[PDB]
Design a protein around this nucleic acid. Structure first.
Lengths: 216, 179, 87, 142
RNA sequence: UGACCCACUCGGCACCUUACGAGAAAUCAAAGUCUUUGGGUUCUGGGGGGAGUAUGGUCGCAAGGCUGAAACUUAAAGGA
RNA sequence: ACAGGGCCCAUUCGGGUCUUGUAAUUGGAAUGAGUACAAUGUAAAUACCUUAACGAGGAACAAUUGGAGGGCAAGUCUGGUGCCAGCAGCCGCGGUAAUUCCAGCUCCAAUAGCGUAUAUUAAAGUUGUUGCAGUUAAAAAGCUCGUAGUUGAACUUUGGGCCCGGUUGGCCGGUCGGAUUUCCAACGGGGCCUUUCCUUCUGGCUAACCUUGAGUCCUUGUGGCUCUUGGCGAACCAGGA
């Protein structure tokens, strides 16, 4: 075995829910992780940085090995988390999950010249953590993935393909860097352009649409 | 003094030098397409990076302005003649979705390979340096040539050459002068 | 958001607080969406039919909401009084 | 309203208040007095000719011990008196007193390298024939 | 009227809470909108010392200030 | 001559038949570096290119210079030394079994060329406009006024209407692999008109049709251009205002 928990778990095992875009519409939580295993399988992992700490005991120095993990596919779906642990083999691992509850859309789209098949972002975004400032900017076609090794990485998994970048921003902080960049793409969706204004009209929540299956 | 004659390098190196990232996609290139040195992957890289902006430059005129169309419709037809991008894609737009790898197939180096007349890619080349292949009745001795689409069908072997004519070829004025 | 030829090219269209036409961005938790209700012409709760509306997180934090709805089902077509556009 | 004048007629007060600032930034210090010609050995250069005196021994700076090999020179110019440093082996041997040597920097500017203290140059040639060879034995000396 | 209560606001002097952001971090509604790198402009620093000394030049009655070297030495000094 | 890395059988050998290989017996072929008749070349020779004669078996006709802890490819081989010699660009070895020194074997890197020192470059987003840092790391002047310097809210024809044509892209290839028409998308661009300066006057200039004196080859016609007469000025000469 999987097994389940909560009203939200049970549903997706059964399969009364299908896509991840249900879940960001009503904007649910997520506690269990299998919740996006069944759905998105495309998903692939990647390990960025394995560093030792340290919390320094009475005749010694303790250590763990922050990893930090990024996950996703191509299509507008990033995942990110940071679980210290001791020994690697919790530390990555129950990083990989840490990221998976944090899957987050993106909102690939056009530079200009509408054309056919999204390559770049919709708009300018920024992010901030402690020090770093990221100014993602939409670039025309295969221009390129203009940035550090790591950012490239994030941004591949999240296709996305092409976009100018810039930092500030101490980016010997692989960890506070990604923290930030992430908090910007996750924020394309958190920016009214004319093409949304056409008022959409609220569906109905899963939490009492399949209310009975959702319980014993 | 005299008109000081004019010249630009073609190469534009990389911004970071070393990477088990981009490196192990050159050696996937060389390789698969013949080539030689890294001073090829970076010639191209330049000449794509060249065209790429004359698009960017435009796009940002309006559309319809005299300059934008003219180049576009002159720009484009320069790439229809070299086979690079299709007919069906040329709006402008689109030339941008052209990666390194499309150009390479229209290098003579390889168009020979496809016109097999060559065991592998290699037997595709000595074959060019050694005066062997020919477009009109005319030899070409340089891998980097760039196939002009409307030639292509005229690609040989020439009279000169040993593999289509004027004589046997050196090592043969030897098996017949020791029985 | 769309292509050259009418192909909605997106993940989704975001849902937008109902009184505040901001946005609701995936992982909000704070996040509500109401399902009040209507009476039928009788002390009977009408079933499988209700109103809707949709709070950000935005305003849960600021006291706001209680006075934001008490604009809206008076402003819609059920309630009478409590509320004033002229304070 | 941060600290700078901003409106339209605020050319005058800007081309001044950068041209002042630049000062301090160290670099633009070298280039106006520029130091390069007056101070330092090479003046406005990169390389030069000199002729050796002694074969001095300079121990270490310390996280180290390391007794390295240095030579005083006599240049063939300001005359400063300089020291300089040798690479490879013993390298020392091949610099036989009052010989002709060809000096260059130490890629650091000014400054002062690794574990050596007041020291700022390397010995490239001798006689003009490499060191590089008069240690991989592609030539020899007169 | 006045004190008061509450409602609202504009301008303060701060504070809590988050972190979507930023950071080496400690922490920060600004240290945010920075490799997706650019709203306006004035100062400053570019290893540690030698030393804010020696020198000149200058303001002061003096204490002293502002200006400000180099030779030499050194693989670390430092931040959290 | 063995060693093999396969294969077809192995009821146990082991052979075997496609293969690299350690070899200290190996034998037939091949050349020019050097030497050198001649021709050449050369004003005159040297050389080159040619070529008769010659010239390859390891002790030759012998390839070196720099390392073999890390950086950084590669010796926890043997011998000596014992914080002394010495090495080491920096981290550092060495104070009795040294993976660093001296040296043997062994291997690694460049290789008719390697090293060595100096200067400069990239590395240097550690001089920076693109691209830095200034809460404590080295740095926001003690704070304010100011002549230069530097920046500086917005607003002064938009829209629409008709044209006509380019040359990319489709649909016919029209044909013994390119010529172009209807069908037709993209896209520029000149007209002209909707209250619409085009410094503008004297000629010559007209170049265009508001002209139309006649008309009709053919798909039962806003598909096709031969001709003088009233009248288009910026297709332009050339003096000025």
């Amino acid at each position: 075995g999987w097994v389940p928990v909560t009203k939200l778990g049970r549903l997706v095992k059964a399969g009364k829910i299908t896509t991840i875009e249900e879940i960001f519409l009503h904007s649910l939580p997520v506690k269990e992780f299998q919740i996006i295993d069944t759905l998105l399988p495309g998903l692939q992992d990647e390990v960025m940085n394995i560093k030792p700490v340290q919390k320094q005991t009475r005749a010694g120095q303790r250590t763990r090995f922050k990893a930090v993990v990024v996950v996703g596919d191509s299509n507008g779906h990033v995942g990110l988390g940071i679980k210290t642990a001791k020994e690697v083999a919790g530390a990555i691992r129950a990083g990989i999950i840490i990221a998976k509850l944090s899957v987050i859309p993106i909102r690939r789209g056009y530079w200009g010249t509408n054309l056919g098949q999204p390559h770049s972002l919709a708009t300018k975004t920024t992010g901030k953590c402690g020090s770093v400032t990221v100014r993602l900017i939409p670039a025309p076609r295969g221009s390129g993935i203009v940035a550090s090794p790591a950012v490239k990485k994030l941004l591949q998994l999240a296709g996305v393909e092409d976009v100018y970048t810039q930092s500030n921003g101490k980016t010997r902080t692989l960890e506070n860097t990604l923290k930030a960049a992430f908090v910007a793409i996750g924020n394309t969706y958190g920016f009214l352009t004319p093409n949304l204004w056409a008022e959409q009209p609220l569906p109905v929540s899963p939490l009492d649409i399949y209310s009975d299956e959702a319980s014993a | 003094p005299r008109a000081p004659r004019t010249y630009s390098k073609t190469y534009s190196t990389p911004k970071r030098p070393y990477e088990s990232s981009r490196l192990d996609a050159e050696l996937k290139l060389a390789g698969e397409f013949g080539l030689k040195n890294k001073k090829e992957i970076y010639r191209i890289s330049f000449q794509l990076s060249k065209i790429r902006r004359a698009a960017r430059d435009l796009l940002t005129r309006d559309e319809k302005d005299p300059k934008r169309l003219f180049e576009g419709n002159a720009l484009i037809r320069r790439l229809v003649r070299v086979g690079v991008l299709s007919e069906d894609k040329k709006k402008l737009d689109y030339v941008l979705a052209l990666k390194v790898e499309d150009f390479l197939e229209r290098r003579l180096q390889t168009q020979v390979y496809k016109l097999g007349l060559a065991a592998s890619v290699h037997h595709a080349r000595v074959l060019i340096t050694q005066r062997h292949i020919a477009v009109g009745k005319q030899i070409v001795n340089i891998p980097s040539f760039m196939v002009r689409l409307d030639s292509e069908k005229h690609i040989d072997f020439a009279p000169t050459s040993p593999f289509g004519g004027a004589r046997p070829g050196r090592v043969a004025r030897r098996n017949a002068a020791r029985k | 958001m769309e292509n050259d030829k009418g192909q909605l090219v997106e993940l989704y269209v975001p849902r937008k607080c109902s009184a505040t036409n901001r946005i609701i961005k995936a992982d909000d938790h704070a996040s509500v969406q109401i399902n009040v209700a209507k009476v039928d012409e009788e002390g009977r709760a009408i079933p499988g039919e209700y109103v809707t509306y949709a709070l950000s997180g935005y305003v849960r934090s600021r006291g706001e909401s209680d006075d934001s709805l008490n604009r809206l089902a008076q402003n819609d077509g059920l309630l009478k009084n409590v509320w004033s556009y002229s304070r | 309203g941060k600290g700078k004048p901003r409106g339209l007629n605020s050319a005058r007060k800007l081309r001044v208040h950068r041209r002042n600032n630049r000062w301090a930034e160290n670099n633009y210090k070298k280039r106006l007095l520029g130091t390069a010609f007056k101070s330092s050995p090479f003046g406005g250069s990169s390389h030069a000719k000199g002729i050796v005196l002694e074969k001095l021994g300079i121990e270490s700076k310390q996280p180290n011990s390391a007794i390295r090999k240095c030579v005083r020179v006599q240049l063939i110019k300001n005359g400063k008196k300089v020291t300089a440093f040798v690479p490879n082996a013993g390298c020392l041997n091949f610099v036989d007193e009052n010989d002709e040597v060809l000096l260059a920097g130490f890629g650091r500017k000014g400054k002062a390298k690794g574990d050596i203290p007041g020291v700022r140059f390397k010995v490239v040639k001798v006689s003009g024939v490499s060191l590089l060879a008069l240690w991989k034995e592609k030539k020899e000396k007169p």
